[PDB]
């Protein structure tokens, strides 16, 4: 079974190693079965994002209470389907931003399993 922690890294972690989002949404099996309407990639280290689980406890958008907000803003890419996007030809607008991230955390080690929001 893919673990929940591995799925968060596959969906949202692209630590550095206009067309950014079209390249990245296919690679991660996020355009493989359907066009995921919105996805955010985080360009900070896995350690800095995992650290958010020890930062400010906040309510998730849905009302779950195991979410955590990063104290600093972080470098992120929002990928959003464009009007011409239609599976299986998915297509995305890229908007780079610097925002606090909010993640839901689970497990031991206690790590992100869900990307909830950026603000």
């Amino acid at each position, epitope marked *: 079974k893919e673990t929940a922690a591995a799925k968060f890294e596959r969906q949202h972690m692209d630590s550095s190693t206009s067309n950014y989002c079209n390249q990245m949404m296919k690679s991660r099996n996020l355009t493989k079965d359907r066009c995921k309407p919105v996805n955010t990639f985080v360009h900070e280290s896995l350690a800095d994002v995992q650290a958010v689980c020890s930062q400010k*406890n906040v309510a998730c958008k849905n009302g779950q209470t195991n979410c955590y907000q990063s104290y600093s803003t972080m470098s992120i890419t929002d990928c959003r389907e464009t009007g011409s996007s239609k599976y299986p030809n998915c297509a995305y607008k890229t908007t780079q931003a610097n925002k606090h991230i909010i993640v839901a955390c689970e497990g031991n080690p206690y790590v992100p399993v869900h990307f909830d929001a950026s603000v």
Partner: nanobody
Framework: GSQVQLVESGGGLVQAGGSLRLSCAASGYAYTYIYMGWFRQAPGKEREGVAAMDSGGGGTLYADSVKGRMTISRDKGKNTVYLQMDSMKPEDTATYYC??????????????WGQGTQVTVSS
């Protein structure tokens, strides 16, 4: 203190039919944990959620097996949680753990855990 600690007190040895109070206070965390709760692991069993409550005194949930004998409260301070246990049963013998920062009785969602307090209910 750079580290967060969930300090547990109370618990220990009691007769079947008796009463005990567990208390937990977090130190080292600068904000308010929205949910805190008590979990336990009894001999022969997996860890299970016993009781949980949110920082406004609501969202209260209990394991069905302890409902009506145990009472959780938080109203005595920031990041504190207490468990009053009455009419105790042999099946309540367990290591009890304070936990903070999760949601309801879902133990995977809690990221801070006390070291564990033994509670032994003598037959």
């Amino acid at each position: 203190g750079s580290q967060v600690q969930l300090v547990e007190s109370g618990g220990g040895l009691v007769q079947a039919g008796g009463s005990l109070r567990l208390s937990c206070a977090a130190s080292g965390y600068a904000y308010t944990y929205i949910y805190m709760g008590w979990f336990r692991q009894a001999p022969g069993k997996e860890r299970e959620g016993v009781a949980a409550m949110d920082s406004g005194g609501g969202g209260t949930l209990y394991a069905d097996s302890v409902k009506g004998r145990m009472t959780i409260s938080r109203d005595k301070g920031k990041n504190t949680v207490y468990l009053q246990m009455d009419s105790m049963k042999p099946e309540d013998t367990a290591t009890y753990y304070c936990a903070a920062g999760g949601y309801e009785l879902r133990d995977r969602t809690y990221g801070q855990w006390g070291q564990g307090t033994q509670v032994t209910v003598s037959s």
